[PDB]
Amino acid sequence: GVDIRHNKDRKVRRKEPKSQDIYLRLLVKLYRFLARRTNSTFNQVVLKRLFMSRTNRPPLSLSRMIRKMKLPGRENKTAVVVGTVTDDVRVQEVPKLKVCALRVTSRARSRILKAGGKILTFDQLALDSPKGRGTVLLSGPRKGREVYRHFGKAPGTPHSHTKPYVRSKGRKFERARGRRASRGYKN
Amino acid sequence: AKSKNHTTHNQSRKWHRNGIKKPRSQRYESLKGVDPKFLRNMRFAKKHNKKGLKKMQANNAKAMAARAEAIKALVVSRKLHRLAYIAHPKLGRRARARIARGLR
Amino acid sequence: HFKEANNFLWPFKLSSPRGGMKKKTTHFVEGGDAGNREDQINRLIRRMN
Amino acid sequence: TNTKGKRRGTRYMFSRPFRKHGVVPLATYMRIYKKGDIVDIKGMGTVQKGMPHKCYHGKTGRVYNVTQHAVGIVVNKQVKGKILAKRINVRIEHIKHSKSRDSFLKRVKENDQKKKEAKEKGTWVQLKRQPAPPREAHFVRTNGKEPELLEPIPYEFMA
Amino acid sequence: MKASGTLREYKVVGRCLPTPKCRTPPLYRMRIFAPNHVVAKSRFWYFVSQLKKMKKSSGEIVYCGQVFEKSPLRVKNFGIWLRYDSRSGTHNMYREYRDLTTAGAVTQCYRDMGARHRARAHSIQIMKVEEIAASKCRRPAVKQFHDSKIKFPLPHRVLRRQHKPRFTTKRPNTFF
RNA sequence: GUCUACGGCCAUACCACCCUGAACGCGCCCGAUCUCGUCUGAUCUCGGAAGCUAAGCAGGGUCGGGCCUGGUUAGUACUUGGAUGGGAGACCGCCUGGGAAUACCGGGUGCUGUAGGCUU
RNA sequence: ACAGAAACCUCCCGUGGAGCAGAAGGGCAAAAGCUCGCUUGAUCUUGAUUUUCAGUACGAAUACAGACCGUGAAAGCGGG
RNA sequence: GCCGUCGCUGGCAGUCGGCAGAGCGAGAAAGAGAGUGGCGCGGACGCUACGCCGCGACGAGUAGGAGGGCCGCUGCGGUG
RNA sequence: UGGAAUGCGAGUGCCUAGUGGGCCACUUUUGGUAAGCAGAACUGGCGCUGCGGGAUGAACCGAACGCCGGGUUAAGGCGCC
RNA sequence: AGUAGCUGGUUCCCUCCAAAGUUUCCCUCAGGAUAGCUGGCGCUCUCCGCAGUUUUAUCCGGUAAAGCGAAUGAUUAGAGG
RNA sequence: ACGGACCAAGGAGUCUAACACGUGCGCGAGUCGGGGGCUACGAAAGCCGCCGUGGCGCAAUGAAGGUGAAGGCCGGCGGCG
Ligand SMILES: [Mg+2]
Ligand SMILES: [Mg+2]
Ligand SMILES: [Mg+2]
Ligand SMILES: [Mg+2]
Ligand SMILES: [Mg+2]
Ligand SMILES: [Mg+2]
Ligand SMILES: [Mg+2]
Ligand SMILES: [Mg+2]
Ligand SMILES: [Mg+2]
Ligand SMILES: [Mg+2]
Ligand SMILES: [Mg+2]
Ligand SMILES: [Mg+2]
Ligand SMILES: [Mg+2]
Ligand SMILES: [Mg+2]
Ligand SMILES: [Mg+2]
Ligand SMILES: [Mg+2]
Ligand SMILES: [Mg+2]
Ligand SMILES: [Mg+2]
Ligand SMILES: [Mg+2]
Ligand SMILES: [Mg+2]
Ligand SMILES: [Mg+2]
Ligand SMILES: [Mg+2]
Ligand SMILES: [Mg+2]
Ligand SMILES: [Mg+2]
Ligand SMILES: [Mg+2]
Ligand SMILES: [Mg+2]
Ligand SMILES: [Mg+2]
Ligand SMILES: [Mg+2]
Ligand SMILES: [Mg+2]
Ligand SMILES: [Mg+2]
Ligand SMILES: [Mg+2]
Ligand SMILES: [Mg+2]
């Protein structure tokens, strides 16, 4: 007998998309080859994200793409997001971008194209940038979800700003005892 | 009926299954709990940092100039050694040619 | 570079001692096998290697 | 069961040593504590204010807050299977500068000088400590004296 | 210590580790009867520890070597002074043996002390071993071999080859 | 050699008794108008300078007590880990490491910071 | 002097062998004890922390911070 | 030796063939580079890429969790 | 000159069942005359676990288990069974 | 189809991982909630960090032992005033 | 210790609602026609857009009255200095 524990032998991580989409898997076949047969780590990172679930592929807003693509030294680079590029009405002027995404919302396409920009698909990025050169990989906010408001210390513990689960919000719904010193205590 | 009252048997075995992890350490700790009077002034010190912004640039450039100026003035066995030299792919490239040329 | 050269080697998987042992449950100086037997390890290594 | 009293079991821990009672030497109050310092916590029963809790007696922490009379200490406390970084307020009577790091700071200064000085002299000096090595071969002179013969002594019932 | 096989006599020399106070500590020697040298050094540290403020950590073995018998082809009488612990006390004994090697006489002592007193070798401390002249021996079992014209037969010679043959037609003879 | 003021560590500095104290100090000391406080100018407070080292205080002494520090006690007592060791047990021995404390014997008897004096 | 084992006065020794509400343990000697003088920090207020702990509540406690104060010559000490 | 699991988040799209040229396992970064001047008509298998291939380690299990079933039963839409 | 040795890839987040009668052994240990008694500390076990030895046996000793061939062992043994 | 913190039962294969009888609160003691122990899903990186270990420094402690011609408490015998 | 003499067939985590997290798909600061209407399988499917009323999301906070989500520099002027 060998003295070893086996509870961590099997690493939990995706080796392929749970999705049965045949176009997603054709991209995965494409980038499986590129990740394997090139020394580019950009190809490996993209390949990994094609496996990621919906909540691990947050949408990237148009405003956030412009903000990150406006930083110095990022001119004439291709913005690459493995996800959906949503539109941000709060933006007034859209510059000329060159983006690659899995999806682009209908209204974000017109705005990007109307400004002279170009919208690629991940099969077109491979022909344009086989190794990922001249790219700017971008991600949507991962903690941008209502669920992360509810995680952490339980709401009834000191300095716990967690959001509770209440059916309705109002004066009659979990505000009396434990949330003010006047009723029992507060923390 | 009566039952067992208390024990800690098996407890250090459970504690160590996921390890007794030490607390996480960050290079910046929270200012929670520090003296309110001292924290009030520290905020005031930060609040007016920008007042001496121009002065800092002048000294830094001046300090850089002096720093750059000072720099600009200032600037086992002999057989096994030989063999280890020849066997080096780069260094012994010519030496390996010499023995090959002579061999022919 | 003993540390690197030694950790590079996998732990040697030796066979059971051919000829048996005296008593694994007591020290060498007690007529057993455990502990430091100094150069007498070589006799053991021959029977296990 | 036991009681949950704050000072249960501190009969000897917080008592003063033998013939060391009475006034507290004032140099205890003249020490300078700065943020980041390492201090050994040791409850002194003469002063009952700002007493550290018994679980912190004999632990070593780090100063993070300094007030008129006390300091804030970040000190690890193990409760069951986890270790918590705890923040305690302790009057400066019940602490002392830890000398555990002083040996290190002394070594850093010595290391840097040797590193600096050796660099200008083009030599490689050892900087890392090492565990005690097995002692090297040597000769033992007999000086013309035969080694003393020892024998076991007979038993005697010196009862 | 386990008195395994025939013991050997070892000469072990040790000392305190030199220190600033005493740059050259004195040397001590011991006669150790043991199975091997690794055991011999171990028992040395057990004896000097009992006599001196010394132990393996604060001392070293200067010399360990086997002392060979000086007259292996000559018969001698040995006197062995030893102390041992019984189930209910400690005792000093003087014993005599007839052998060719001093280490053989000591091995006879351990097997004999085990036989006659159920004494395990970890309770026996051999203090002294001397070669003794026939005139100075005390034990009647040893003195009866001090006879220049000694003679005796071998009565009732037991058959030791009792399974070759295992079955035979003739009964053995014990007279020769 | 040393003191005065303020100290740090807080007996190697304490306690008992004896001897000796140049100079300057520190004192004892002489008074109660004022400040101040008492049953009491004893103490405290105030104003002084005839006298004295008697005492405090300083240095030294004692086969001094204490205290500090070593030796011995002792590789002893105790102890971490080991054995299909012993013994009916009580307990004990050994292997691998750590390792005390009395009695008893010796040595020592304040060091020192800041400022200011005295000592040809 | 009455006055005695024990009343009150005086001198000396006295490391606490007393006292500090109470159980015990700890702490304490120009004090934390005893006696006087002035007083109400046992007041108003927001956070942090400790103890039990689930790192929840209460209870109790610790450092601060902001006001009003007391006391002291003052340093300071005090929000039971 | 064989089975499975885990790991190398390992290798294979290069079956680039007469519009040809057979390599990228090798101690030690980066090109089997491009150019400018001084007779036969032939050459296995493979690759359901959810596939195929290699190398190394490992394998107890109640309560309990998870995965995979070209395991099994009945009915519906397609298909054979 | 990543500033002791040794070994090892780590960090982090959600959701979560069963459990919440335990019991045994070395050492330490409370009550009791003691108990295969009641109650604790430490570690290791049985429970959840087969296998070689202890004739037999929850826990002892050895040793932990995919299906096999050869070899060698542990604790234990070698009159016959 | 009353309720049952209680008794009994709960139906195919293989593979992988694998407990608890402990903390606190509860008219709580045959039960729950709670933390712990488990599993699953991942994700963020990697090819500095960490450790049921030692070493070197440095603190903490009042048990084993020892002491009682040392304090407290208990206690035997003489001896000199 | 309890159930089990034997054989066949039957025999026990389901369905509705709510909630939580995970995963897959659609669209995306929006999204959803579920109620209503129009136009054998078909009680299906298709459509509506001045049918998006309405739900959830896009704003929090306070008991409430209510309020309700960056600033810096330049020049000039009035006041204090
Ligand atoms: Mg295995
Ligand atoms: Mg397992
Ligand atoms: Mg697992
Ligand atoms: Mg219970
Ligand atoms: Mg053989
Ligand atoms: Mg054992
Ligand atoms: Mg004079
Ligand atoms: Mg007077
Ligand atoms: Mg005098
Ligand atoms: Mg003396
Ligand atoms: Mg002096
Ligand atoms: Mg006072
Ligand atoms: Mg205040
Ligand atoms: Mg298994
Ligand atoms: Mg029991
Ligand atoms: Mg069970
Ligand atoms: Mg288990
Ligand atoms: Mg088992
Ligand atoms: Mg038996
Ligand atoms: Mg076999
Ligand atoms: Mg029912
Ligand atoms: Mg019914
Ligand atoms: Mg019940
Ligand atoms: Mg109740
Ligand atoms: Mg039951
Ligand atoms: Mg105790
Ligand atoms: Mg005792
Ligand atoms: Mg029943
Ligand atoms: Mg029946
Ligand atoms: Mg059936
Ligand atoms: Mg979802
Ligand atoms: Mg119909």
3-state secondary structure of C34: strand
Q: Is D152 exposed, middle or buried (0-12, 13-18, 19+ CB in 10 A)?
A: middle
Q: How far is the CA of A9 from the centre of ligand 1 (A)?
A: 15
Number of residues assigned to chain E: 176
Closest CA relative to residue A56, chosen from A13, A92, A94: A13
Closest-CA distance, B98 to chain D, in angstroms, reads 36
Task: Give DSSP secondary structure letters for B4-67.
Answer: -----TTHHHHHTTS--PPPP--SS---TTS-HHHHHHHHHHHHTGGGGHHHHHHHHHHHHHHH
* Distance linking the first and last C-alpha atoms of chain A: 52
Alpha carbons A68 and E61: distance in angstroms, whole number: 74
A182 to each of A159, A160, A162, A163, A185, how far by Cα in Å? 18, 19, 21, 21, 7
Task: State both tokens at D39.
Answer: 């201090």
Are β-strands D70-79 and D82-91 bridged in parallel, bridged antiparallel, or unpaired?
A: antiparallel
Alpha carbons B2 and B5: distance in angstroms, whole number: 9
Closest-CA distance, B4 to chain D, in angstroms, reads 13
D139 phi, psi to nearest 5 deg:
-110, 140
> Cβ neighbours of residue E174 under 8 Å, at least 6 residues apart?
E156, E157, E158, E159
**Strands (E) located in chain D:** 38-41, 60-66, 70-79, 82-91, 95-97, 148-149
D87 phi, psi to nearest 5 deg:
-110, 115
Q: How far is the CA of D7 from the centre of ligand 13 (A)?
A: 28
Alpha carbons D39 and D31: distance in angstroms, whole number: 11
Task: State both tokens at A87.
Answer: 């539109």
Please count the residue pairs, one from chain D and one from chain E, whose beta carbons lie less than 8 angstroms apart.
50
Tell me, what DSSP letter sits at residue A182?
A: T
Scanning B21-60 for CB atoms below 8 A from D yields 21-23, 29, 33-35
- Kindly give the interhelix angle for A22-37 and A41-51, rounded to the nearest 10 degrees: 150
Say how far C24 CA is from H15 C1', in Å. 62
Provide the H-helix boundaries in A52-171.
62-69, 106-114, 122-128
- E64 C-beta neighbours (distance < 10 Å), count: 16
Alpha carbons D22 and C9: distance in angstroms, whole number: 64
> Please, which chains are in contact with E (at least 3 CB pairs closer than 8 A)?
C, D
Breaks in chain C at C–N > 2.5 Å: after which residues?
none
C23 phi, psi to nearest 5 deg:
-160, 105
Alpha carbons E175 and A175: distance in angstroms, whole number: 115
Q: Which residues from chain E sit within 8 angstroms of residue C29, using beta carbons?
A: 1, 38-39, 42
Q: Are B35 and D67 in contact (CB < 8 Å)?
A: yes
B98 phi, psi to nearest 5 deg:
-60, -45
Instruction: Say whether the CB atom of E37 is under 7 angstroms from strand F.
Output: no
Q: Are E48 and D150 in contact (CB < 8 Å)?
A: yes
Amino acid residing at C42:
N
Please state the separation of Cα E42 from the chain's center in Å.
Answer: 17
CA within 13 Å, CB half, D97: 14
Task: State both tokens at E46.
Answer: 């057990």
Task: Give DSSP secondary structure letters for chain E.
Answer: ----SS-EEEEEEEEEPP-SS-SSPPEEEEEEEESSHHHHHHHHHHHHHHHSS--GGGEEEEEEEEPPPS-TTS-EEEEEEEEEEETTEEEEEEEEEEESSHHHHHHHHHHHHHHHH---GGGEEEEEEEEE-GGG---HHHHTT--TT------S-----TTTTSS-SS------
Q: What is the resolution of this structure in A?
A: 2.8
Question: Contact E82/E127 with Cβ under 8 angstroms?
Answer: yes
> Cβ neighbours of residue E110 under 8 Å, at least 6 residues apart?
E3, E7, E121, E124
- Nearest nt (C1') from D130 Cα: I4
- E133 C-beta neighbours (distance < 10 Å), count: 9
In E, what residues contact D, Cβ < 8 A? 13, 15, 24, 26-31, 47-48, 50-52, 60, 62, 81, 83, 90-92, 125-128
E121 phi, psi to nearest 5 deg:
-65, -20
Residue with tokens 């043991």: E34
- What residues pair up with A94 in beta bridges, in sequence order? none
Dihedral, CA of residue A144, residue A145, residue A150 and residue A152, to nearest 10: -40
Residue with tokens 């029977």: C47
Residue with tokens 């053995």: E172
User: A51 in the Ramachandran plot: left (φ > 0), alpha (ψ -120 to 50) or beta?
Assistant: alpha
Task: State both tokens at E66.
Answer: 């086997």
A105 to each of A112, B88, D116, E126, how far by Cα in Å? 11, 60, 62, 98
Residue with tokens 């995706």: A14
Question: Contact E53/D124 with Cβ under 8 angstroms?
Answer: no
Question: Contact A142/A58 with Cβ under 8 angstroms?
Answer: yes
Method: cryo-EM
3-state secondary structure of D100: coil
Question: Contact D61/D74 with Cβ under 8 angstroms?
Answer: yes
- What residues pair up with E89 in beta bridges, in sequence order? E86
Alpha carbons C2 and D137: distance in angstroms, whole number: 21
Question: Contact E126/E33 with Cβ under 8 angstroms?
Answer: yes
> Cβ neighbours of residue E49 under 8 Å, at least 6 residues apart?
E55
Please state the separation of Cα E107 from the chain's center in Å.
Answer: 4
Instruction: Say whether the CB atom of B69 is under 7 angstroms from strand G.
Output: no
Q: Does C28 touch chain E (CB under 8 A)?
A: yes
Alpha carbons D54 and D76: distance in angstroms, whole number: 14
- E143 C-beta neighbours (distance < 10 Å), count: 15
Residue with tokens 């001090």: E146
Please state the separation of Cα E112 from the chain's center in Å.
Answer: 10
